Write a protein that binds this ligand. Structure first.
Ligand SMILES: Nc1ncnc2c1ncn2[C@@H]1O[C@H](CSCC[C@H](N)C(=O)O)[C@@H](O)[C@H]1O
Ligand SMILES: Nc1ncnc2c1ncn2[C@@H]1O[C@H](CSCC[C@H](N)C(=O)O)[C@@H](O)[C@H]1O
Lengths: 318, 318
């Protein structure tokens, strides 16, 4: 009874989604028990329908039942606060943008053309779409901020940023990485390069409106590519790394912060197929990072894991 | 952890769907191993794109890896044969029809109107849409054939069908229920009533083009409603039962075979949400079946669970 459960497990995602999307989850903070009848009235939902949804959520262990009402389980508490990796994943991923594409994914395999499953559906690139769909961009940036904040602590321990002067984050969106590093390391020129509609404003953090497919600005002694190359096939990844080498002098260092694919890595493997669907891209093994680095004329000096799924790679021009 | 795994678990569904939809799963019969680079070459898929998909399928436990290729695990062997409950569930459920409806479900809750989440997406009713998409109706009927075959053995043991001469199955798709009884109980007039484009063909089985919302044909001593009523709200459900009672005489019997609304079953709980999403309908307690049957002018004589999920109801006229 494993296979049928794997196939129908999507309904649990969908049930969690409707509970978040209808704005009900916000009422379940501090494991507080809430009355289904009063919740139905607040949002003008048929109690009968809302009680049946809650019964399904009880069976999948999301909600717990009492004579006081229903509350979120200890394991599913994070549905309460909007700024959790769980809540923001529901907002970012559970929508037509991904689910229309997942349905088109089997066609993108059979029709081997330059179009990703997403491109076939939307008729644009994923990042071209985010320019239009503003709500999804803010959700994307919010989810990416959480994955940045898991890393800052071990990143600041493992790598020495204090030795550098000028730092450039290639594709750093809202400069969360650099904002968080600037918090624990002062006396540094922090700059973020990314394709912006409106350039983000800060103090101490510089924001360039550029493109890493065009020659990258010189002067920087530290370049960073955090969760970028996994959005680009080998030929496009090489293009980005070639421009990095050209922009780098002898002493300059390139930091790759990525989800490292390992023979045992479910979390990284599920995201691998997601990157294929969206960008026709992938997560890469250590050997695959060297392959694209060697073709760009860069050499791997250091590689170390930051946590269970994230890793760091130091590349220098040699 | 629980919550995030539940949210992202839909990617496992999508992975299995893609593996089936593209038509690869057929090459894994009798749990026999297979080369990826070979598979990729046959259908014209980029080795990388498919090998990465198969890498993820190994992690979730659907495939097993080895030096000489990949195979379907013992637990996921059912993906191989086309007529399996798991395969037919993938073909039927994992498509735009359900997935777009799931994404609309939280809108249908807030918009407290008669229109189901399906109607809000498709504009038509579920069965109105199936009369246009012939391929989905074939997949739907094929899946309902499997859920019939689970019940036959115990249904024949629990109900004596040899005491009946003329038998009408109201909404019996391809008459699997009557085909499977016609094998075990012989010399009977087996007629199946349902909305059809092309009338199904089977030895010793008649097939009427009919609507149970219109007057039902008299002169049958057994009428059957298997997995019909739970597709209809109370008012539509009572109309069907009213037509049944009016069609029945004093000696006639009505069988209802249905998923009873059980308090503890996760399988039954998820299907209830599915009935709301597709039909604006619900599963009913034994007391709620009495209510609608009472209003229709029918009495309950026999109720019995055929297994953990399905149950039978004998109704008579008075
Ligand atoms: N051609 C291009 N030039 C520059 N940045 C680009 C780009 N195409 C995509 N990007 C940016 O690449 C980023 C990928 S997501 C990574 C964001 C950030 N480094 C983090 O890890 O949190 C996005 O911010 C996107 O805007
Ligand atoms: N108005 C209507 N009149 C008659 N049959 C209808 C109908 N609307 C739907 N149906 C039929 O009702 C069935 C519900 S699904 C159940 C099929 C079958 N009893 C089984 O268990 O295998 C479908 O076959 C559908 O075609």
């Amino acid at each position: 009874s494993m296979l049928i459960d794997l196939i129908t497990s999507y309904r649990k995602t969908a049930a969690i989604y409707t509970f978040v999307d209808a704005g009900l989850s916000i009422h379940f903070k501090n494991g507080d028990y809430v009355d289904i009848n009063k919740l139905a009235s607040q949002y003008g939902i048929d109690y009968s329908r809302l009680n049946r949804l809650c019964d399904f959520l009880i069976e999948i262990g999301v909600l717990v039942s009492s004579d006081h009402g229903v509350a979120l389980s200890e394991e599913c508490s994070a549905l309460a606060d909007p700024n959790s990796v769980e809540f923001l994943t529901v907002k970012y991923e559970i929508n037509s943008e991904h689910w229309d594409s997942w349905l088109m994914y089997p066609k993108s395999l059979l029709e081997n053309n330059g179009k990703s499953a997403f491109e076939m559906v939307h008729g644009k690139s994923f990042f071209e779409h985010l320019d239009s769909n503003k709500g999804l961009k803010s959700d994307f940036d919010a989810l990416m901020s959480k994955y940045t904040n898991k890393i800052i602590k071990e990143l600041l321990v493992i790598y020495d940023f204090d030795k550098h002067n000028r730092i450039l984050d290639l594709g750093g969106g809202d400069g969360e990485l650099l904002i968080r590093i600037s918090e624990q390391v002062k006396g540094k020129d922090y700059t973020v390069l990314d394709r912006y509609n409106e350039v983000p404003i800060s103090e101490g953090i510089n924001f360039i409106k550029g493109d890493f497919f065009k020659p990258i600005p010189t002067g920087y002694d530290l370049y960073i590519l955090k969760n970028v190359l996994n959005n680009w096939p080998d030929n496009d990844a090489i293009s980005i790394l070639k421009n990095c080498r050209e922009a780098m002098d002898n002493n300059a260092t390139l930091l790759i912060i990525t989800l490292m694919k390992k023979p045992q890595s479910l979390v990284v493997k599920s995201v691998d197929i997601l990157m294929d669907m969206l960008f026709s891209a992938k997560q890469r093994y250590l050997s695959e990072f060297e392959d694209i680095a060697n073709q760009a004329g860069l050499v791997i000096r250091h590689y170390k894991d930051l946590d269970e799924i994230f890793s760091l790679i130091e590349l220098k021009v040699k």
